[PDB]
Amino acid sequence: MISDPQVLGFIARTEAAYPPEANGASAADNRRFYDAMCAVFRGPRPPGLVVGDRRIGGVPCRVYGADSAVSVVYVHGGGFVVGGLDSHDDVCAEIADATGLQVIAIDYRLAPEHRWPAQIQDVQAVWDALDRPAVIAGDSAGGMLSAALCLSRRGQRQPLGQVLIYPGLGGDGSAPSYRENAGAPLLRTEDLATYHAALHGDGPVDPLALPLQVEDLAGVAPAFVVSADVDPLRDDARDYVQRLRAAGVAAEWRNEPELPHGYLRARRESDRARRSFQAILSAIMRFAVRG
Amino acid sequence: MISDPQVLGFIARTEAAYPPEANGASAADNRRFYDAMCAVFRGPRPPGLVVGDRRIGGVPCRVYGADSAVSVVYVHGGGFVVGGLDSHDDVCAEIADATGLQVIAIDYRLAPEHRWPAQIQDVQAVWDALDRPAVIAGDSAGGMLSAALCLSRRGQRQPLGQVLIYPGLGGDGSAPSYRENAGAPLLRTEDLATYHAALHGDGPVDPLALPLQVEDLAGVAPAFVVSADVDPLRDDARDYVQRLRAAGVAAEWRNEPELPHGYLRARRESDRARRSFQAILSAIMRFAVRG
């Protein structure tokens, strides 16, 4: 059980912030509910930070901050169905403000209207148009996409690092967290299926859509992987770090006691979540400098 | 004038946390009042973080985190008169937690009972005893001491970087900020001399004690200097960075709109202060990784 009252307060505010309405609630409605939920917690932009909206590799992006020698590509979460540039605007703006690195957020095509591999193709399109040193970072589904981008980009345009924030990485579901945290606040194991079904339909699953089931992970970017402890996806982070290290990749697992999935939104009201984002920023800075 | 309501609420809470009534209050009483104000805003330790108290170089210190290849030495502020390990505990613990670098905080001898150079002798004693790659960091009076440490240690035992947080650095008081922010919340130009008087008493003014007046700054550690805009000391940061860079030292000046002196304590309730500490942690990480 979570016992931190600040986190309990954040959970209650999230649940109130998102009406259950799970009937005749299209992906379009879920998009409006998610954006409304994020707006509850969304922080302000730094006043002096330059922000531009434009297409990169043909994909709508938002660019935060002046051009820098190293960039950060941020891939937003939302189970491949929801989210966008506005839902994660404050996270991306705060990375740019804290590190002085230009941040590129990607508005990739969403499921179910666009099935896999549309999402990774859009991240690749942006990545390949950057042609510049960059760290890649993402939360939840965006962590998966960041990991899949790294798996596809092991050559000379390798990300300097991958910073994966409570990612889903296509674990097989047998790891302890899936049962331990099956009834976790904010994300139940059973919710993962709805986003799986929207992402792939029922045909074949592209193995690249399951980074943890990829047989050979060698040569991908070094990784900082942070998990919410009270989250069915927690042990995807543990397992991925274990596999990366086994494949010769420098990787660190940070687990966050008492925090649920989605806690980036709690950083303005939870010390644990605030400290987690502080460690995430340090990891981004670390990877950026080491390049 | 500050108009951010979060910062105005922090100022109002600070003023309520600290009933003025000076008039014969002893420095020992001011220490009790400072600690009591700090406790209102002090965040919790990361629960898994190893923390120990030990005398290092003969000076009581607190060590946060496991041994690391690069460490952080933190020097608390308090006008050379108040503060200690407990007043800044959360700041130092959050540095170690976010960066994974071991943090060593120094409880140097305080004025007026101990006058200069007691304080720098104590920082020098810890620095020399540690004998390791480290960033040095400090707020307010701790920033002056960190800058003075760097000026005194320019051989191969130089810090990898100096992170100076709303420091007083020995400006003559003629810069605009001393007039513009003379009536600022939390710190006013009128209060500044009392701290100098306590630090030196009757003694000689050692050039080391006025980093901004030191003729030759060549060869000191690269700097990240962050000022509060609504602080009479703001322009000490601008002036030191200007002189550092002219002396061939890499230095970054970050000024914080809408923030008063002492805003580290506001990072749990102010987005502006939270983002500032996020940038401070990145600067520390950046210096550690370069080194």
XYZ file of C-alpha atoms in Angstrom:
582
model
C 0.000 0.000 0.000
C 1.124 3.549 -0.732
C 1.471 5.473 2.521
C 3.014 8.807 1.450
C 0.182 11.358 1.924
C 1.451 13.647 -0.833
C 1.283 10.771 -3.305
C -2.128 9.736 -2.000
C -3.205 13.330 -2.583
C -1.841 13.266 -6.127
C -3.636 9.983 -6.809
C -6.936 11.392 -5.547
C -6.480 14.518 -7.660
C -5.696 12.445 -10.764
C -8.771 10.253 -10.308
C -10.998 13.191 -9.838
C -9.263 14.756 -12.817
C -10.204 11.860 -15.078
C -13.861 10.765 -15.216
C -14.300 6.986 -15.473
C -16.725 7.290 -18.443
C -15.640 4.052 -20.142
C -18.715 3.728 -22.390
C -18.947 4.788 -26.057
C -15.804 6.661 -25.086
C -13.855 6.709 -28.353
C -10.097 7.219 -28.558
C -11.080 10.798 -29.390
C -12.813 11.210 -26.024
C -9.929 9.568 -24.203
C -7.668 12.130 -25.880
C -9.776 14.961 -24.455
C -9.872 13.388 -20.974
C -6.098 12.783 -20.903
C -5.307 16.314 -22.027
C -7.706 17.667 -19.386
C -6.110 15.453 -16.728
C -2.614 16.597 -17.691
C -3.709 20.225 -17.647
C -4.639 19.874 -13.965
C -0.989 19.244 -13.109
C 0.745 21.089 -15.955
C 3.275 23.652 -14.859
C 4.142 26.914 -16.554
C 6.757 27.513 -19.198
C 9.901 29.386 -18.183
C 9.245 32.982 -19.261
C 12.339 33.528 -21.381
C 12.494 30.142 -23.110
C 12.076 30.290 -26.894
C 9.529 27.786 -28.168
C 8.817 26.954 -31.795
C 6.276 24.679 -33.445
C 7.311 23.221 -36.783
C 7.613 20.025 -38.764
C 10.841 18.016 -38.569
C 11.200 15.113 -40.940
C 7.569 15.858 -41.827
C 6.247 15.277 -38.288
C 4.791 18.120 -36.170
C 7.222 18.917 -33.364
C 7.806 21.535 -30.707
C 11.348 22.889 -30.230
C 12.284 24.325 -26.825
C 15.329 26.530 -26.378
C 18.146 27.818 -28.565
C 20.162 25.481 -30.738
C 22.810 23.629 -28.785
C 25.671 21.272 -29.560
C 23.696 18.372 -28.036
C 19.923 18.067 -28.215
C 17.275 16.121 -26.309
C 14.474 14.340 -28.141
C 11.464 13.830 -25.889
C 8.796 11.246 -26.769
C 5.587 11.741 -24.830
C 3.549 8.936 -23.316
C -0.126 8.108 -23.459
C -0.358 4.422 -24.294
C 0.148 5.219 -28.024
C -3.458 6.503 -28.085
C -3.378 9.859 -26.223
C -0.999 12.689 -25.468
C 0.779 15.162 -27.681
C 2.829 18.316 -27.557
C 0.540 20.207 -25.205
C 0.012 17.367 -22.685
C 3.759 17.156 -21.894
C 4.672 20.783 -22.612
C 5.932 21.601 -19.136
C 8.101 18.482 -18.854
C 9.875 19.329 -22.128
C 10.200 23.024 -21.305
C 11.725 22.176 -17.912
C 14.285 19.840 -19.477
C 15.365 22.643 -21.796
C 15.476 25.225 -19.012
C 17.411 23.054 -16.584
C 20.007 21.642 -18.987
C 20.373 24.398 -21.546
C 19.855 21.721 -24.207
C 17.416 22.207 -27.052
C 14.432 19.870 -26.611
C 12.465 18.410 -29.524
C 9.072 16.934 -28.655
C 7.382 14.758 -31.294
C 3.668 14.689 -32.165
C 3.662 11.171 -33.597
C 0.579 9.584 -35.167
C -1.699 7.956 -32.622
C -3.361 4.579 -32.439
C -5.861 3.082 -33.154
C -6.252 5.135 -36.342
C -2.567 4.545 -37.130
C -1.272 1.164 -36.042
C 2.308 0.206 -35.377
C 4.806 0.946 -36.911
C 3.466 4.450 -37.617
C 4.647 5.727 -34.230
C 8.235 4.491 -34.477
C 8.416 5.639 -38.103
C 7.519 9.177 -36.983
C 10.112 9.143 -34.219
C 12.658 7.823 -36.721
C 11.679 10.517 -39.223
C 12.358 13.211 -36.628
C 15.518 11.480 -35.400
C 16.939 11.111 -38.895
C 16.164 14.731 -39.758
C 17.996 15.942 -36.669
C 21.379 14.600 -37.824
C 22.897 15.873 -34.587
C 24.075 14.486 -31.242
C 21.112 13.930 -28.971
C 19.864 12.160 -25.893
C 16.463 10.499 -26.295
C 13.962 10.443 -23.449
C 10.375 9.403 -22.977
C 7.710 8.419 -20.445
C 5.571 5.273 -20.608
C 4.758 4.525 -24.277
C 7.282 7.212 -25.211
C 9.886 5.271 -23.284
C 9.036 2.247 -25.410
C 9.362 4.338 -28.532
C 12.650 5.761 -27.283
C 13.955 2.246 -26.624
C 12.752 1.060 -30.043
C 14.381 4.078 -31.666
C 17.647 3.113 -29.958
C 17.278 -0.505 -31.115
C 16.884 0.755 -34.700
C 19.654 3.352 -34.470
C 22.793 1.520 -33.367
C 25.071 2.880 -36.079
C 26.773 6.276 -36.331
C 23.599 8.234 -35.435
C 23.215 6.490 -32.119
C 21.535 8.487 -29.335
C 24.029 9.591 -26.718
C 21.792 7.920 -24.150
C 18.263 6.782 -23.528
C 16.389 8.049 -20.474
C 13.278 5.912 -20.025
C 10.704 7.105 -17.503
C 8.428 4.328 -16.197
C 8.512 2.752 -19.666
C 6.447 -0.099 -20.945
C 8.929 -2.211 -22.843
C 6.875 -5.231 -23.887
C 7.690 -7.569 -21.027
C 5.877 -10.876 -21.223
C 3.811 -10.217 -18.091
C 5.439 -12.931 -15.985
C 7.570 -10.510 -13.946
C 6.449 -9.865 -10.339
C 5.287 -6.280 -10.892
C 2.447 -7.343 -13.208
C 0.788 -9.290 -10.400
C 2.201 -7.341 -7.415
C 0.876 -4.059 -8.855
C -2.044 -5.465 -10.877
C -4.422 -3.197 -8.951
C -2.072 -0.215 -8.677
C -3.537 3.290 -8.595
C -3.641 5.035 -11.986
C -2.488 1.999 -14.004
C -3.786 -1.545 -13.676
C -2.188 -4.403 -15.600
C -5.597 -4.879 -17.224
C -5.466 -1.338 -18.690
C -2.325 -2.267 -20.645
C -4.354 -4.520 -22.960
C -6.584 -1.741 -24.313
C -3.485 0.115 -25.515
C -1.908 -3.076 -26.890
C -5.063 -3.752 -28.917
C -5.186 -0.207 -30.291
C -1.493 -0.302 -31.189
C -1.311 -3.554 -33.176
C -4.861 -4.744 -33.734
C -4.712 -8.534 -33.956
C -2.281 -9.319 -36.742
C 1.281 -9.972 -36.076
C 3.263 -8.192 -33.442
C 6.326 -6.587 -34.973
C 9.086 -7.863 -32.618
C 10.547 -4.311 -32.567
C 7.362 -3.309 -30.731
C 8.624 -5.452 -27.823
C 12.111 -4.207 -26.873
C 12.327 -6.634 -23.929
C 11.701 -9.602 -26.246
C 14.368 -8.552 -28.750
C 16.956 -11.315 -28.697
C 20.082 -9.143 -29.041
C 20.249 -5.706 -27.413
C 23.979 -5.122 -27.906
C 25.224 -1.762 -29.111
C 22.268 0.424 -28.120
C 22.772 3.705 -26.273
C 23.571 3.672 -22.545
C 20.415 3.824 -20.497
C 18.990 5.411 -17.384
C 15.716 3.655 -16.632
C 13.471 4.845 -13.820
C 10.447 2.909 -12.602
C 7.508 3.748 -10.419
C 7.511 1.030 -7.776
C 3.716 0.830 -7.547
C 3.176 0.264 -11.251
C 2.547 -3.011 -13.147
C 5.299 -1.968 -15.567
C 7.980 -1.589 -12.870
C 9.851 -4.774 -13.702
C 10.045 -3.935 -17.409
C 12.572 -1.354 -16.242
C 14.365 -3.841 -14.002
C 14.383 -6.510 -16.713
C 15.484 -4.142 -19.481
C 18.394 -2.854 -17.392
C 19.392 -6.453 -16.618
C 19.311 -7.400 -20.312
C 21.152 -4.239 -21.388
C 23.948 -4.894 -18.891
C 24.097 -8.496 -20.091
C 24.534 -7.159 -23.633
C 27.457 -4.938 -22.588
C 25.368 -1.748 -22.361
C 25.886 0.644 -19.450
C 22.513 0.897 -17.785
C 21.182 2.011 -14.432
C 17.841 1.097 -12.870
C 16.322 3.604 -10.470
C 13.148 2.435 -8.733
C 10.854 4.921 -7.008
C 9.262 3.646 -3.788
C 5.692 4.795 -3.144
C 5.133 6.245 -6.563
C 2.566 5.170 -9.186
C 2.741 5.218 -12.960
C 2.492 8.720 -14.383
C 4.164 10.442 -11.442
C 5.924 13.065 -13.626
C 2.693 15.007 -13.106
C 3.155 14.832 -9.308
C 6.525 16.645 -9.281
C 4.894 19.932 -8.301
C 3.266 18.409 -5.218
C 5.297 15.327 -4.178
C 8.843 15.356 -2.813
C 9.443 11.823 -4.088
C 8.232 12.702 -7.570
C 10.133 16.000 -7.536
C 13.333 14.190 -6.538
C 12.730 11.628 -9.260
C 12.472 14.304 -11.958
C 15.614 15.901 -10.513
C 17.448 12.586 -11.008
C 15.998 12.239 -14.509
C 17.369 15.670 -15.437
C 20.803 14.792 -14.028
C 20.780 11.622 -16.119
C 19.912 13.567 -19.247
C 22.661 16.065 -18.490
C 25.119 13.201 -17.804
C 24.463 11.526 -21.145
C 24.584 14.864 -22.951
C 27.990 15.827 -21.532
C 29.536 12.375 -22.067
C 29.106 13.096 -25.787
C 8.624 43.973 -7.473
C 7.686 40.295 -7.142
C 4.273 39.423 -8.571
C 4.388 35.613 -8.771
C 1.737 34.492 -6.211
C 3.633 31.332 -5.321
C 6.706 33.384 -4.450
C 4.643 35.961 -2.580
C 3.170 33.109 -0.545
C 6.635 31.750 0.187
C 7.751 35.201 1.352
C 4.659 35.565 3.532
C 5.221 32.110 5.034
C 8.912 32.894 5.649
C 8.135 36.183 7.367
C 5.552 34.412 9.568
C 8.055 31.624 10.281
C 10.527 34.227 11.544
C 9.148 36.891 13.885
C 11.625 39.799 13.659
C 12.234 41.117 17.218
C 15.969 41.632 17.139
C 17.017 44.077 19.838
C 19.636 42.275 21.870
C 18.813 38.897 20.408
C 22.010 36.953 20.788
C 23.680 35.272 17.841
C 22.717 32.025 19.618
C 19.068 33.092 19.510
C 19.336 34.046 15.831
C 20.633 30.512 15.259
C 17.543 29.065 16.956
C 15.286 31.316 14.884
C 17.039 30.490 11.601
C 16.860 26.751 12.231
C 13.182 27.083 13.141
C 12.418 28.998 9.977
C 14.371 26.473 7.878
C 12.402 23.587 9.408
C 9.125 24.999 8.096
C 10.419 24.538 4.530
C 12.831 21.621 4.976
C 11.958 18.647 2.807
C 12.513 15.050 3.817
C 15.548 12.916 3.170
C 15.385 10.268 0.467
C 14.643 7.214 2.620
C 17.198 4.916 1.035
C 20.065 7.401 1.115
C 22.992 6.532 3.381
C 23.882 9.539 5.569
C 26.585 9.801 8.216
C 28.129 12.486 10.394
C 31.886 12.528 10.657
C 34.733 14.885 11.415
C 36.685 15.471 8.216
C 39.808 17.570 8.490
C 38.753 18.231 12.090
C 35.468 19.838 11.005
C 32.022 18.303 11.628
C 30.673 17.180 8.272
C 27.741 15.195 6.940
C 28.277 12.654 4.164
C 25.376 11.834 1.809
C 25.407 8.839 -0.530
C 27.881 6.083 -1.296
C 31.469 6.744 -2.358
C 31.669 8.043 -5.919
C 34.445 8.882 -8.369
C 33.418 12.558 -8.195
C 31.982 14.152 -5.069
C 30.182 17.389 -4.224
C 31.339 19.622 -1.377
C 28.480 21.800 -0.128
C 28.962 24.935 1.999
C 25.813 26.201 3.681
C 24.882 29.859 3.914
C 23.534 31.904 6.780
C 25.561 35.093 6.690
C 28.533 33.330 8.370
C 26.462 33.545 11.580
C 23.695 30.935 11.352
C 23.096 27.640 9.564
C 24.712 24.245 9.815
C 24.213 20.662 8.754
C 20.571 20.389 9.826
C 19.388 23.688 8.251
C 20.491 22.635 4.738
C 20.057 18.870 5.139
C 17.445 18.448 2.439
C 19.333 20.468 -0.180
C 22.461 18.324 0.244
C 20.523 15.063 0.367
C 18.669 16.008 -2.803
C 21.984 16.769 -4.535
C 23.344 13.329 -3.693
C 20.058 11.641 -4.620
C 19.711 13.413 -7.949
C 23.322 13.164 -9.141
C 24.482 9.950 -7.494
C 27.534 11.883 -6.325
C 28.619 11.687 -2.735
C 27.922 15.015 -1.022
C 30.007 16.323 1.879
C 28.498 19.228 3.798
C 30.635 21.360 6.113
C 29.689 22.738 9.552
C 32.281 25.486 9.691
C 32.910 27.647 12.747
C 30.506 30.569 12.885
C 30.910 34.269 13.476
C 30.930 36.401 15.544
C 32.567 34.037 18.046
C 34.996 32.968 15.310
C 36.109 35.637 12.896
C 37.659 35.295 9.471
C 39.644 33.321 8.421
C 38.126 30.634 10.689
C 35.419 29.808 8.143
C 37.678 29.435 5.112
C 40.251 27.569 7.209
C 37.506 25.060 7.959
C 36.389 24.704 4.331
C 40.049 24.393 3.288
C 40.560 21.698 5.926
C 37.675 19.590 4.643
C 38.658 20.212 1.019
C 42.282 19.165 1.602
C 41.269 16.162 3.729
C 38.885 14.885 1.044
C 41.687 14.988 -1.575
C 39.393 13.967 -4.397
C 37.724 15.175 -7.599
C 34.786 17.257 -6.469
C 32.471 20.077 -7.411
C 32.168 22.730 -4.714
C 28.807 24.366 -4.153
C 27.292 26.800 -1.711
C 24.473 29.251 -1.089
C 24.846 32.837 0.073
C 27.742 33.071 2.510
C 28.472 29.472 1.505
C 28.918 30.752 -2.036
C 31.543 33.277 -0.945
C 33.408 30.537 0.928
C 33.229 28.224 -2.094
C 34.576 30.982 -4.319
C 37.321 31.764 -1.796
C 38.191 28.089 -1.569
C 38.697 28.038 -5.346
C 40.848 31.172 -5.291
C 43.061 29.581 -2.645
C 43.400 26.110 -4.223
C 44.377 26.694 -7.843
C 46.944 23.810 -8.205
C 45.960 20.278 -9.104
C 43.596 20.208 -6.091
C 41.254 22.692 -7.738
C 37.541 21.810 -7.682
C 36.051 20.567 -10.937
C 33.566 23.415 -10.758
C 32.061 25.955 -8.440
C 28.294 26.279 -8.135
C 27.456 29.553 -6.385
C 23.821 30.058 -5.345
C 22.734 33.675 -4.711
C 26.241 34.382 -3.328
C 27.568 37.475 -1.680
C 31.028 37.846 -3.163
C 32.335 41.112 -1.714
C 30.995 43.694 -4.123
C 31.509 47.246 -2.941
C 27.738 47.834 -2.757
C 27.674 50.279 -5.672
C 26.114 47.942 -8.239
C 22.463 48.640 -9.197
C 21.049 45.654 -7.304
C 22.061 47.189 -3.969
C 19.747 50.144 -4.609
C 17.092 48.449 -6.766
C 16.623 45.623 -4.280
C 17.402 47.597 -1.111
C 13.878 46.907 0.103
C 13.637 43.375 -1.269
C 11.829 40.654 0.672
C 13.915 38.356 2.888
C 17.215 40.204 2.306
C 17.812 43.967 2.262
C 20.987 45.977 1.654
C 20.760 47.296 5.229
C 21.195 43.770 6.641
C 24.358 43.084 4.606
C 26.940 44.969 6.684
C 25.941 43.198 9.917
C 27.225 39.933 8.447
C 30.516 41.488 7.301
C 30.945 43.057 10.745
C 30.396 39.647 12.319
C 32.829 37.914 9.962
C 35.784 40.249 10.384
C 35.071 42.197 13.573
C 38.203 44.267 14.119
C 40.383 42.316 11.777
C 42.220 42.883 8.551
C 40.271 42.663 5.393
C 41.875 39.727 3.689
C 41.498 39.926 -0.145
C 40.450 36.266 -0.098
C 37.335 37.369 1.813
C 36.235 39.579 -1.103
C 36.428 37.349 -4.191
C 35.081 40.217 -6.325
C 38.050 42.372 -5.249
C 40.743 39.774 -5.963
C 42.951 41.148 -8.735
C 43.888 37.852 -10.449
C 41.140 35.255 -10.856
C 43.008 33.242 -13.488
C 42.922 29.485 -13.137
C 39.988 29.008 -10.779
C 37.406 26.332 -11.374
C 34.723 27.003 -14.030
C 31.616 28.470 -12.467
C 27.841 28.299 -12.488
C 26.556 31.354 -10.640
C 22.816 31.747 -10.108
C 21.406 34.975 -8.682
C 17.976 35.852 -7.375
C 16.820 38.882 -9.314
C 15.060 40.426 -6.308
C 18.175 40.355 -4.097
C 20.614 43.204 -3.329
C 23.445 40.714 -3.955
C 22.221 39.892 -7.472
C 24.842 41.959 -9.244
C 27.688 40.367 -7.269
C 26.928 37.295 -9.368
C 26.875 39.289 -12.616
C 30.115 41.032 -11.685
C 31.961 37.874 -10.611
C 31.008 36.024 -13.803
C 32.190 38.992 -15.859
C 35.554 39.031 -14.101
C 35.907 35.237 -14.202
C 35.350 35.127 -17.942
C 37.679 38.041 -18.611
C 40.240 36.017 -16.612
C 39.885 32.992 -18.903
C 37.549 30.944 -16.680
C 34.386 29.445 -18.123
C 31.410 30.798 -16.241
C 27.664 30.873 -16.627
C 25.402 33.456 -15.012
C 21.765 32.506 -14.504
C 19.478 35.183 -13.080
C 16.118 34.201 -11.614
C 13.167 36.511 -12.342
C 10.721 37.007 -9.488
C 12.814 35.249 -6.845
C 14.240 36.645 -3.599
C 17.378 35.682 -1.725
C 17.043 32.318 -0.027
C 14.738 30.749 -2.595
C 16.274 27.271 -2.290
C 13.768 26.912 0.521
C 10.939 27.742 -1.931
C 11.570 24.860 -4.362
C 8.810 22.766 -2.815
C 6.162 25.408 -3.401
C 7.427 27.610 -6.275
C 7.776 26.506 -9.883
C 10.387 29.213 -10.431
C 12.443 28.038 -7.451
C 11.903 24.390 -8.362
C 13.209 25.039 -11.912
C 16.175 26.923 -10.476
C 17.242 24.035 -8.310
C 16.732 21.784 -11.331
C 19.252 23.936 -13.205
C 21.646 23.972 -10.251
C 21.596 20.154 -10.153
C 22.321 19.970 -13.874
C 25.234 22.392 -13.526
C 26.690 20.223 -10.772
C 26.256 17.096 -12.903
C 27.800 18.920 -15.876
C 30.933 19.876 -13.927
C 31.263 16.407 -12.422
C 31.065 14.660 -15.774
C 33.413 17.030 -17.594
C 35.982 16.576 -14.822
